[PDB]
Amino acid sequence: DLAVIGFELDTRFTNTNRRQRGHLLQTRALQFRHPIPMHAPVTLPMDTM
Amino acid sequence: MGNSNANLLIQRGMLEVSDTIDPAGRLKNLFVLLGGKVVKFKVDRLPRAV
Known part of the structure; x- marks a missing residue:
């Protein structure tokens, strides 16, 4: 039965008529907010005299 | 603020508007x-x- 039975071609369309877009690009932005906390103090007591 | 540890620590009624x-x-x-x-x-x- 030695014979060629089928084939596949590596053909493609040309988008001179822009039928296909492919992947899309868009711009994005994210924000991170980092407010600074206040921390507990350290004190040096004295004598008011 | 009123249910914070600040009130129940020393005296129950310390809190005033001076705290934020x-x-x-x-x-x-x-x-x-x-x-x-x-x-x-x-x-x-x-x-x-x-």
Whole structure:
């Protein structure tokens, strides 16, 4: 039965008529907010005299 | 503020308008009831906990 039975071609369309877009690009932005906390103090007591 | 440790620490009625909350706060922990028992999630540093 030695014979060629089928084939596949590596053909493609040309988008001179822009039928296909492919992947899309868009711009994005994210924000991170980092407010600074206040921390507990350290004190040096004295004598008011 | 009224239910904070500040009032129950020394005298119950210390709090006055001179005290304020620091705006720089975060959601420190989130407790979920998972199938009848509680699981503690540490979420303090997540970008959406601020």
